[PDB]
Design an enzyme around this catalytic site. Structure first.
Site, PDB file in Angstrom:
ATOM      1  N   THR A   1       0.856  -1.220   0.000  1.00 36.51           N
ATOM      2  CA  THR A   1       0.000   0.000   0.000  1.00 36.51           C
ATOM      3  C   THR A   1       0.877   1.250   0.000  1.00 36.51           C
ATOM      4  O   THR A   1       1.797   1.379   0.811  1.00 36.51           O
ATOM      5  CB  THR A   1      -0.965   0.022   1.207  1.00 36.51           C
ATOM      6  OG1 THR A   1      -1.685  -1.217   1.272  1.00 36.51           O
ATOM      7  CG2 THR A   1      -1.962   1.175   1.092  1.00 36.51           C
ATOM      8  N   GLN A   2       0.582   2.160  -0.923  1.00 36.30           N
ATOM      9  CA  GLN A   2       1.356   3.387  -1.093  1.00 36.30           C
ATOM     10  C   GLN A   2       0.466   4.562  -1.497  1.00 36.30           C
ATOM     11  O   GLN A   2      -0.758   4.435  -1.557  1.00 36.30           O
ATOM     12  CB  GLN A   2       2.479   3.176  -2.122  1.00 36.30           C
ATOM     13  CG  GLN A   2       2.038   2.535  -3.433  1.00 36.30           C
ATOM     14  CD  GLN A   2       3.156   2.464  -4.458  1.00 36.30           C
ATOM     15  OE1 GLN A   2       3.761   1.413  -4.659  1.00 36.30           O
ATOM     16  NE2 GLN A   2       3.441   3.590  -5.107  1.00 36.30           N
ATOM     17  N   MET A 107      -0.870  -6.474  -2.836  1.00 35.72           N
ATOM     18  CA  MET A 107      -1.260  -5.260  -2.098  1.00 35.72           C
ATOM     19  C   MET A 107      -0.251  -4.108  -2.198  1.00 35.72           C
ATOM     20  O   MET A 107      -0.337  -3.129  -1.453  1.00 35.72           O
ATOM     21  CB  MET A 107      -1.608  -5.577  -0.632  1.00 35.72           C
ATOM     22  CG  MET A 107      -2.932  -6.306  -0.445  1.00 35.72           C
ATOM     23  SD  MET A 107      -4.374  -5.371  -1.003  1.00 35.72           S
ATOM     24  CE  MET A 107      -4.518  -4.133   0.284  1.00 35.72           C
ATOM     25  N   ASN A 108       0.692  -4.230  -3.131  1.00 42.95           N
ATOM     26  CA  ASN A 108       1.674  -3.186  -3.407  1.00 42.95           C
ATOM     27  C   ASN A 108       1.637  -2.807  -4.892  1.00 42.95           C
ATOM     28  O   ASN A 108       2.467  -3.273  -5.676  1.00 42.95           O
ATOM     29  CB  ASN A 108       3.075  -3.646  -2.982  1.00 42.95           C
ATOM     30  CG  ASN A 108       4.147  -2.597  -3.233  1.00 42.95           C
ATOM     31  OD1 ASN A 108       5.239  -2.917  -3.700  1.00 42.95           O
ATOM     32  ND2 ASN A 108       3.839  -1.340  -2.928  1.00 42.95           N
TER      33      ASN A 108
END
Lengths: 233, 140
Positions: A1-2, A107-108
């Protein structure tokens, strides 16, 4: 997550009778600050494909590095690297589409919206979209961000369906793209006047145009507008 | 006594590694290959023994490319040469990823050098049966 830090706005595209046209402006936005002005957001792969990326610029540069490695990897142990076994626009997209979906599943994600424009070896036009979610779709016209809301309605007036594709020439298609870039400079707050435009044709090949500016702007009507309701002077 | 040539990393009484010298015999048996350095580049050339008329001409390419500027040619066990080039391509990609600039030829020479030398340090690995001629043009 970013989260996206340095961002690129709309990437708009359409297909005509002999190929495709893709365009994006040269801005690298830092929030509300229009920080960088020398950013090329259209990445040509070979002589038959141009990849337009919007969103995170650091992720764009990573994708740019991946595309250069793909060219190097394809040429390994390949005597027909510039002929039959050259990189097709379909191969380039599918690779990126696999990467984009894998990253969101971990999730990235790569915080991007990508349009792959090009002409296949048989002459067929290729235009497909892929984003940070891994969602893929094809359409006669494709646009990211603000282009999807503003440029798409204008470009669909020229090509509404698949039967309109062979009826649209290069001159008419490019005129629609240049006009769409002007409209985006009018209403998008994260847009630039300077932009790049790429034409991939099955006959004339790849034509990359740099340092294009939005011209013929209507602003004269502003002098007649004063106040916000009741003010006369 | 005897039996020093049976294992790889074992030193013989004369301070030699016989398993490596035995790999040289595999190179000497192999096809001849050459390299010529000119005033601004390098030229590689290899012999291709036609075993039968059944072999398709201009197809079984022996010379391999590393990155976009390095060319590799080898003599002896052809599969061993491919393994070395595969590593060289991984090593060239690792250099470009971190340092941006394409790998210099003296830099690339050491990367292959250390890898082949590593296969002479253990009894679990076999020495390479190839002598590789390679090079290209870099910064200087």
């Amino acid at each position: 997550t970013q989260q996206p830090i340095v961002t690129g706005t709309s990437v708009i595209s359409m297909k005509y009778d002999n190929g495709v046209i893709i365009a994006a402006d040269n801005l690298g936005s830092y929030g509300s600050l229009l920080r960088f002005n020398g950013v090329e957001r259209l990445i040509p792969v070979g002589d038959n494909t141009v990849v337009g990326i919007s969103g995170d610029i650091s992720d764009m540069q990573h994708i740019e590095r991946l595309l250069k490695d793909l060219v190097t990897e394809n040429a390994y142990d390949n005597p027909l690297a510039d002929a039959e076994e050259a990189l097709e626009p379909s191969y380039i997209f599918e690779y990126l589409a696999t990467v984009m979906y894998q990253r969101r599943s971990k999730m990235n994600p790569l915080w991007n919206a990508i349009i792959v424009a090009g002409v296949q070896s048989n002459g067929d036009q290729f235009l497909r979209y892929v984003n940070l979610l891994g969602v893929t779709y094809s359409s006669p016209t494709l646009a990211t961000g603000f282009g999807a809301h503003m440029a798409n309605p204008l470009l669909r007036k020229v090509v509404d369906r698949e039967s309109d594709i062979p009826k649209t020439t290069v001159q008419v298609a490019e005129e629609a793209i240049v006009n769409a870039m002007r409209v985006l400079y009018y209403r998008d707050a994260r847009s630039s006047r300077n932009f790049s435009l790429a034409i991939i044709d099955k006959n004339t090949g790849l034509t990359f145009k740099k340092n294009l500016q939005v011209e013929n702007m209507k602003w004269d009507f502003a002098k007649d507008i004063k106040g916000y309701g009741t003010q006369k002077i | 006594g005897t039996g020093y040539d049976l294992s790889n990393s074992v030193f013989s009484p004369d301070g030699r590694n016989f398993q490596v010298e035995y790999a040289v015999k595999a190179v000497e048996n192999g096809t001849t290959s050459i390299g010529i350095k000119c005033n601004d580049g390098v030229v590689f050339a290899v012999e291709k023994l036609i075993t039968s008329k059944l072999l398709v001409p201009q197809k079984n390419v022996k010379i391999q490319v590393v990155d976009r500027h390095i060319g590799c040619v080898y003599s002896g066990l052809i599969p061993d040469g491919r393994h070395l080039v595969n590593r060289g391509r991984e090593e060239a990609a690792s250099f470009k990823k971190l340092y941006k600039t394409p790998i210099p030829i003296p830099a690339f020479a050491d990367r292959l050098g250390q890898y082949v030398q590593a296969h002479t340090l253990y009894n679990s690995v076999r020495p390479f049966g190839v002598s590789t001629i390679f090079g290209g043009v870099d910064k200087n």
